[PDB]
mmCIF file of C-alpha atoms in Angstrom:
data_model
loop_
_atom_site.group_PDB
_atom_site.id
_atom_site.type_symbol
_atom_site.label_atom_id
_atom_site.label_comp_id
_atom_site.label_asym_id
_atom_site.label_seq_id
_atom_site.Cartn_x
_atom_site.Cartn_y
_atom_site.Cartn_z
ATOM 1 C CA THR W 1 125.319 82.325 116.591
ATOM 2 C CA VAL W 2 128.845 84.409 117.082
ATOM 3 C CA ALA W 3 129.172 87.310 114.682
ATOM 4 C CA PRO W 4 132.350 88.244 113.721
ATOM 5 C CA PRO W 5 134.122 91.520 115.021
ATOM 6 C CA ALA W 6 132.787 94.810 113.822
ATOM 7 C CA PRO W 7 135.620 96.741 111.356
ATOM 8 C CA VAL W 8 137.673 98.831 113.366
ATOM 9 C CA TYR W 9 138.039 102.333 111.804
ATOM 10 C CA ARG W 10 141.661 103.613 112.641
ATOM 11 C CA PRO W 11 126.039 98.680 80.914
ATOM 12 C CA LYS W 12 126.098 97.782 84.954
ATOM 13 C CA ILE W 13 123.543 95.126 85.375
ATOM 14 C CA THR W 14 122.281 96.672 88.535
ATOM 15 C CA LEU W 15 119.301 96.007 90.630
ATOM 16 C CA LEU W 16 117.223 99.058 88.720
ATOM 17 C CA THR W 17 118.946 97.873 85.106
ATOM 18 C CA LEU W 18 117.673 94.516 85.984
ATOM 19 C CA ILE W 19 113.704 95.812 86.581
ATOM 20 C CA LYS W 20 114.193 98.217 83.339
ATOM 21 C CA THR W 21 114.918 95.733 81.347
ATOM 22 C CA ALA W 22 112.412 93.280 82.572
ATOM 23 C CA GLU W 23 110.193 96.291 82.460
ATOM 24 C CA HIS W 24 110.523 96.854 79.057
ATOM 25 C CA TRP W 25 110.661 93.333 77.792
ATOM 26 C CA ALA W 26 107.272 92.481 79.323
ATOM 27 C CA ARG W 27 106.010 95.077 76.997
ATOM 28 C CA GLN W 28 107.328 93.398 74.182
ATOM 29 C CA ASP W 29 106.100 90.913 71.866
ATOM 30 C CA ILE W 30 108.412 88.170 72.225
ATOM 31 C CA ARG W 31 106.532 85.396 69.627
ATOM 32 C CA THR W 32 108.791 86.161 66.862
ATOM 33 C CA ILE W 33 112.226 87.338 68.531
ATOM 34 C CA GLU W 34 115.481 85.200 67.351
ATOM 35 C CA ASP W 35 117.073 82.439 69.008
ATOM 36 C CA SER W 36 120.029 84.735 70.737
ATOM 37 C CA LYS W 37 117.401 87.401 72.258
ATOM 38 C CA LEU W 38 115.341 84.740 73.595
ATOM 39 C CA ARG W 39 118.265 82.726 74.994
ATOM 40 C CA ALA W 40 119.200 86.093 76.678
ATOM 41 C CA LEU W 41 115.743 86.256 78.443
ATOM 42 C CA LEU W 42 115.708 82.901 79.936
ATOM 43 C CA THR W 43 119.109 84.169 81.861
ATOM 44 C CA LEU W 44 116.704 87.591 82.647
ATOM 45 C CA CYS W 45 113.961 85.306 83.980
ATOM 46 C CA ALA W 46 116.690 83.076 85.772
ATOM 47 C CA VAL W 47 118.536 86.143 87.434
ATOM 48 C CA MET W 48 114.836 87.709 88.315
ATOM 49 C CA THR W 49 113.661 84.250 89.555
ATOM 50 C CA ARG W 50 116.830 84.497 92.354
ATOM 51 C CA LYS W 51 116.225 88.101 93.207
ATOM 52 C CA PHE W 52 112.992 86.660 94.995
ATOM 53 C CA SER W 53 113.242 84.957 98.547
ATOM 54 C CA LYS W 54 113.005 81.074 98.099
ATOM 55 C CA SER W 55 109.443 81.354 100.305
ATOM 56 C CA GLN W 56 108.070 83.492 97.651
ATOM 57 C CA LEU W 57 107.959 81.274 94.568
ATOM 58 C CA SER W 58 104.940 79.319 95.944
ATOM 59 C CA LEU W 59 102.659 82.664 95.427
ATOM 60 C CA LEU W 60 104.831 83.291 91.945
ATOM 61 C CA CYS W 61 104.128 79.980 90.876
ATOM 62 C CA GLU W 62 100.186 80.652 91.951
ATOM 63 C CA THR W 63 100.127 84.159 90.047
ATOM 64 C CA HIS W 64 101.741 82.293 86.900
ATOM 65 C CA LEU W 65 98.840 79.730 87.025
ATOM 66 C CA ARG W 66 96.040 82.386 87.611
ATOM 67 C CA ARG W 67 97.807 84.817 84.724
ATOM 68 C CA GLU W 68 97.369 81.570 82.009
ATOM 69 C CA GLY W 69 94.694 80.196 83.101
ATOM 70 C CA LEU W 70 96.472 77.090 83.998
ATOM 71 C CA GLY W 71 94.376 74.110 86.067
ATOM 72 C CA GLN W 72 96.196 73.830 89.205
ATOM 73 C CA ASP W 73 97.804 70.116 88.103
ATOM 74 C CA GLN W 74 100.223 72.283 86.199
ATOM 75 C CA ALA W 75 100.794 73.646 89.956
ATOM 76 C CA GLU W 76 103.958 71.520 90.585
ATOM 77 C CA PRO W 77 106.169 71.215 86.843
ATOM 78 C CA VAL W 78 105.847 75.904 87.097
ATOM 79 C CA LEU W 79 106.931 75.630 90.916
ATOM 80 C CA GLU W 80 109.558 73.383 90.210
ATOM 81 C CA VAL W 81 111.296 75.560 86.988
ATOM 82 C CA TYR W 82 111.329 78.453 89.186
ATOM 83 C CA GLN W 83 112.519 76.663 92.625
ATOM 84 C CA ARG W 84 115.511 75.028 89.765
ATOM 85 C CA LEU W 85 116.163 78.669 88.668
ATOM 86 C CA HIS W 86 116.522 80.008 91.832
ATOM 87 C CA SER W 87 118.485 76.706 93.447
ATOM 88 C CA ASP W 88 120.614 76.808 90.254
ATOM 89 C CA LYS W 89 124.331 77.021 89.456
ATOM 90 C CA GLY W 90 126.700 77.402 86.402
ATOM 91 C CA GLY W 91 123.153 78.018 84.241
ATOM 92 C CA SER W 92 122.926 74.148 84.619
ATOM 93 C CA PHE W 93 119.235 73.738 84.903
ATOM 94 C CA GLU W 94 118.752 77.178 82.857
ATOM 95 C CA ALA W 95 120.351 75.130 79.752
ATOM 96 C CA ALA W 96 118.869 72.257 80.591
ATOM 97 C CA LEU W 97 115.381 74.046 79.941
ATOM 98 C CA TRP W 98 116.454 75.884 76.957
ATOM 99 C CA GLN W 99 117.376 72.340 75.354
ATOM 100 C CA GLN W 100 114.386 70.217 76.455
ATOM 101 C CA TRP W 101 111.621 72.402 76.178
ATOM 102 C CA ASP W 102 110.198 73.722 72.809
ATOM 103 C CA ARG W 103 110.366 77.640 71.715
ATOM 104 C CA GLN W 104 106.504 77.999 71.997
ATOM 105 C CA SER W 105 106.361 76.706 75.914
ATOM 106 C CA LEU W 106 109.513 79.371 76.547
ATOM 107 C CA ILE W 107 107.880 82.117 75.269
ATOM 108 C CA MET W 108 105.007 81.844 76.992
ATOM 109 C CA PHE W 109 106.548 80.683 80.668
ATOM 110 C CA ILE W 110 108.581 84.134 80.313
ATOM 111 C CA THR W 111 106.280 86.839 79.220
ATOM 112 C CA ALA W 112 103.921 85.114 82.320
ATOM 113 C CA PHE W 113 107.344 85.768 84.506
ATOM 114 C CA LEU W 114 108.063 89.101 82.682
ATOM 115 C CA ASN W 115 104.350 90.353 83.733
ATOM 116 C CA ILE W 116 104.232 89.175 86.923
ATOM 117 C CA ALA W 117 107.637 89.268 88.811
ATOM 118 C CA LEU W 118 107.165 93.413 88.818
ATOM 119 C CA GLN W 119 103.932 93.658 90.327
ATOM 120 C CA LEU W 120 104.317 90.785 93.321
ATOM 121 C CA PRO W 121 106.214 91.210 96.622
ATOM 122 C CA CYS W 122 110.318 89.978 95.954
ATOM 123 C CA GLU W 123 109.578 88.936 100.103
ATOM 124 C CA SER W 124 107.163 86.784 101.236
ATOM 125 C CA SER W 125 108.683 86.736 105.144
ATOM 126 C CA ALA W 126 105.592 88.201 107.578
ATOM 127 C CA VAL W 127 108.520 89.024 109.807
ATOM 128 C CA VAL W 128 110.441 90.822 107.037
ATOM 129 C CA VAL W 129 107.220 92.462 105.756
ATOM 130 C CA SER W 130 105.973 93.555 109.133
ATOM 131 C CA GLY W 131 110.075 94.562 109.771
ATOM 132 C CA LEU W 132 110.318 97.185 106.753
ATOM 133 C CA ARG W 133 107.165 98.680 107.518
ATOM 134 C CA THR W 134 108.493 102.002 109.447
ATOM 135 C CA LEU W 135 110.620 102.634 106.457
ATOM 136 C CA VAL W 136 108.401 102.488 103.251
ATOM 137 C CA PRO L 1 122.323 64.163 83.415
ATOM 138 C CA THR L 2 119.576 67.475 84.235
ATOM 139 C CA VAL L 3 115.727 66.638 83.355
ATOM 140 C CA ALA L 4 113.780 69.847 83.655
ATOM 141 C CA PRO L 5 110.290 69.010 84.420
ATOM 142 C CA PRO L 6 107.506 69.189 81.671
ATOM 143 C CA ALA L 7 106.173 72.672 80.316
ATOM 144 C CA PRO L 8 103.003 73.702 81.449
ATOM 145 C CA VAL L 9 99.615 71.909 79.854
ATOM 146 C CA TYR L 10 97.234 74.892 78.477
ATOM 147 C CA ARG L 11 93.694 73.483 77.983
ATOM 148 C CA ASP L 12 92.401 77.055 77.070
ATOM 149 C CA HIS L 13 93.612 80.237 76.190
ATOM 150 C CA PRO L 14 102.476 98.977 100.411
ATOM 151 C CA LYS L 15 104.611 95.827 98.570
ATOM 152 C CA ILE L 16 107.772 94.871 99.233
ATOM 153 C CA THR L 17 108.376 95.163 95.572
ATOM 154 C CA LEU L 18 111.891 94.850 94.168
ATOM 155 C CA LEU L 19 111.243 98.767 92.963
ATOM 156 C CA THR L 20 109.739 99.302 96.354
ATOM 157 C CA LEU L 21 113.105 97.797 97.947
ATOM 158 C CA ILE L 22 115.660 100.215 95.825
ATOM 159 C CA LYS L 23 113.185 103.261 96.631
ATOM 160 C CA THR L 24 113.193 102.985 100.371
ATOM 161 C CA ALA L 25 117.543 101.893 99.989
ATOM 162 C CA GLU L 26 118.001 105.359 97.792
ATOM 163 C CA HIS L 27 115.445 107.451 100.504
ATOM 164 C CA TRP L 28 117.475 106.133 103.362
ATOM 165 C CA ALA L 29 121.035 106.233 101.959
ATOM 166 C CA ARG L 30 120.395 110.074 101.435
ATOM 167 C CA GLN L 31 119.362 109.978 105.494
ATOM 168 C CA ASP L 32 121.915 110.949 108.733
ATOM 169 C CA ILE L 33 121.210 107.737 110.590
ATOM 170 C CA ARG L 34 123.228 108.544 113.363
ATOM 171 C CA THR L 35 120.199 110.130 115.499
ATOM 172 C CA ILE L 36 117.249 107.941 114.397
ATOM 173 C CA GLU L 37 115.129 105.449 116.997
ATOM 174 C CA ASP L 38 116.186 101.846 117.820
ATOM 175 C CA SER L 39 113.376 100.872 116.006
ATOM 176 C CA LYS L 40 114.158 102.643 112.502
ATOM 177 C CA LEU L 41 117.811 101.112 113.131
ATOM 178 C CA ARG L 42 116.542 97.885 113.685
ATOM 179 C CA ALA L 43 114.666 97.841 110.466
ATOM 180 C CA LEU L 44 117.636 99.164 108.346
ATOM 181 C CA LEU L 45 119.605 96.067 109.327
ATOM 182 C CA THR L 46 116.756 93.841 108.025
ATOM 183 C CA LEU L 47 117.076 95.935 104.832
ATOM 184 C CA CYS L 48 120.671 95.381 104.813
ATOM 185 C CA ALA L 49 120.225 91.565 105.246
ATOM 186 C CA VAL L 50 117.111 91.737 102.313
ATOM 187 C CA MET L 51 119.070 93.919 100.197
ATOM 188 C CA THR L 52 122.627 91.694 100.424
ATOM 189 C CA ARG L 53 120.253 88.539 99.280
ATOM 190 C CA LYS L 54 119.362 90.190 96.267
ATOM 191 C CA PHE L 55 123.428 90.231 94.896
ATOM 192 C CA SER L 56 124.624 87.253 93.959
ATOM 193 C CA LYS L 57 127.207 84.946 95.864
ATOM 194 C CA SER L 58 130.012 85.882 93.858
ATOM 195 C CA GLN L 59 129.263 89.527 93.937
ATOM 196 C CA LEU L 60 130.413 89.750 98.144
ATOM 197 C CA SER L 61 134.053 90.012 97.285
ATOM 198 C CA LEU L 62 133.472 93.782 95.315
ATOM 199 C CA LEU L 63 130.738 94.636 97.920
ATOM 200 C CA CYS L 64 133.530 94.060 100.370
ATOM 201 C CA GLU L 65 135.761 95.575 98.882
ATOM 202 C CA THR L 66 133.321 98.744 97.667
ATOM 203 C CA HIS L 67 132.601 99.030 101.266
ATOM 204 C CA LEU L 68 136.592 99.439 102.585
ATOM 205 C CA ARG L 69 137.377 101.755 99.922
ATOM 206 C CA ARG L 70 134.269 104.209 100.771
ATOM 207 C CA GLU L 71 135.482 103.798 104.433
ATOM 208 C CA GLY L 72 138.381 104.050 104.702
ATOM 209 C CA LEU L 73 139.022 100.707 106.477
ATOM 210 C CA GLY L 74 142.542 98.700 105.928
ATOM 211 C CA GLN L 75 143.238 95.099 103.931
ATOM 212 C CA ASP L 76 142.684 93.412 107.244
ATOM 213 C CA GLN L 77 139.247 94.947 107.868
ATOM 214 C CA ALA L 78 137.567 93.000 104.683
ATOM 215 C CA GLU L 79 137.266 89.100 105.977
ATOM 216 C CA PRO L 80 135.406 90.563 108.942
ATOM 217 C CA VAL L 81 133.414 92.713 106.710
ATOM 218 C CA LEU L 82 132.918 90.323 103.636
ATOM 219 C CA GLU L 83 131.852 87.861 106.980
ATOM 220 C CA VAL L 84 128.853 90.013 107.561
ATOM 221 C CA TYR L 85 127.903 89.638 103.668
ATOM 222 C CA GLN L 86 128.432 86.298 103.329
ATOM 223 C CA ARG L 87 126.064 85.070 106.952
ATOM 224 C CA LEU L 88 123.807 87.904 105.654
ATOM 225 C CA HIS L 89 122.939 86.328 102.099
ATOM 226 C CA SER L 90 122.802 82.965 103.882
ATOM 227 C CA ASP L 91 121.009 83.690 106.680
ATOM 228 C CA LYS L 92 118.060 81.904 108.083
ATOM 229 C CA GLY L 93 115.102 83.396 109.882
ATOM 230 C CA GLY L 94 116.751 86.594 110.432
ATOM 231 C CA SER L 95 119.521 84.287 112.774
ATOM 232 C CA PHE L 96 122.899 86.013 111.846
ATOM 233 C CA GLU L 97 120.913 89.301 111.311
ATOM 234 C CA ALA L 98 119.993 89.235 115.352
ATOM 235 C CA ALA L 99 122.959 88.306 116.754
ATOM 236 C CA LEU L 100 124.752 91.509 115.001
ATOM 237 C CA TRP L 101 121.983 93.290 116.600
ATOM 238 C CA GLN L 102 122.803 91.949 119.965
ATOM 239 C CA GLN L 103 126.471 91.757 119.868
ATOM 240 C CA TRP L 104 127.510 94.593 117.832
ATOM 241 C CA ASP L 105 127.950 98.514 119.364
ATOM 242 C CA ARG L 106 124.654 101.109 118.129
ATOM 243 C CA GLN L 107 128.106 103.096 116.430
ATOM 244 C CA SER L 108 129.380 100.114 114.261
ATOM 245 C CA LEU L 109 126.027 98.903 113.117
ATOM 246 C CA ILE L 110 125.028 102.993 112.473
ATOM 247 C CA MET L 111 128.386 103.029 110.192
ATOM 248 C CA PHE L 112 127.659 99.377 108.407
ATOM 249 C CA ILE L 113 124.492 100.091 107.183
ATOM 250 C CA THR L 114 124.882 103.659 106.000
ATOM 251 C CA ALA L 115 128.404 102.242 103.861
ATOM 252 C CA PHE L 116 126.202 99.498 102.675
ATOM 253 C CA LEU L 117 123.344 101.668 101.861
ATOM 254 C CA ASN L 118 125.881 103.980 100.111
ATOM 255 C CA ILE L 119 127.240 101.347 98.034
ATOM 256 C CA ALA L 120 124.282 98.795 96.902
ATOM 257 C CA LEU L 121 122.534 100.848 94.614
ATOM 258 C CA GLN L 122 125.696 101.748 92.417
ATOM 259 C CA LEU L 123 127.166 98.418 92.022
ATOM 260 C CA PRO L 124 126.027 95.921 89.847
ATOM 261 C CA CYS L 125 124.027 93.353 91.413
ATOM 262 C CA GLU L 126 125.638 89.765 89.299
ATOM 263 C CA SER L 127 129.331 89.311 88.715
ATOM 264 C CA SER L 128 129.392 86.469 86.191
ATOM 265 C CA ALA L 129 130.728 87.390 83.153
ATOM 266 C CA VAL L 130 128.173 84.890 81.542
ATOM 267 C CA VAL L 131 125.215 86.444 82.945
ATOM 268 C CA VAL L 132 126.218 90.345 82.792
ATOM 269 C CA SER L 133 127.309 89.044 78.739
ATOM 270 C CA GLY L 134 124.192 86.804 78.075
ATOM 271 C CA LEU L 135 122.027 90.224 79.685
ATOM 272 C CA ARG L 136 123.836 92.642 77.491
ATOM 273 C CA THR L 137 121.698 92.645 74.047
ATOM 274 C CA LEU L 138 118.837 92.934 76.371
ATOM 275 C CA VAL L 139 119.558 96.287 78.594
#
């Protein structure tokens, strides 16, 4: 790999605002909220899923199952949602989820995600985690 | 046509979190890293690469331009700056990140890392008007 030459010297939705929004909504009862707020929460989950490394999605899936009491047979559909939100372009998969899932299924999934996302590490790589150790 | 998987079937009824990453960046943005040890500088390069990936691909242009403005760099310097951000954002197994460490001089790495840490926490991590308008009602 060849690096480029070094430089020659002659409401903002920031990472923190995203976390704060998730913390607030993880604490709320969204079972009765309006469709417009629920649609926005789906976007929040899609954006936040993309703040997890691709390799961390397996643990995210498994933590989701454990919190919800879901069986191991339910792992692939849950992992598929996370993987396809993570690789989503122009909200294509996110819109398919909104259109094809029942409201109750989306509320269950969004609540489970919001209540696990802030406690899980956003990186799974042993090299990244060991690399960052000296800085924390 | 995009087909979503079936919904889950209910039969009955220091960790590197995103907040830790932000707190680590906040702390190191305030430090003078001109004299720190190589092991801490190497770790800061990993912190920059990991954070870069917390920005959407489309937000990289604004990140590069904010970097150029803070540093007083000319517009002819935007492509190699954006190249760094684009290749850290798509990096696999730290391949591009290691090439930087190996090929750039210590001064260049210090300058780049300081500039990034001092701009990363103030920039939105999303550029899409659809995403930003979608999230508006929730903030």
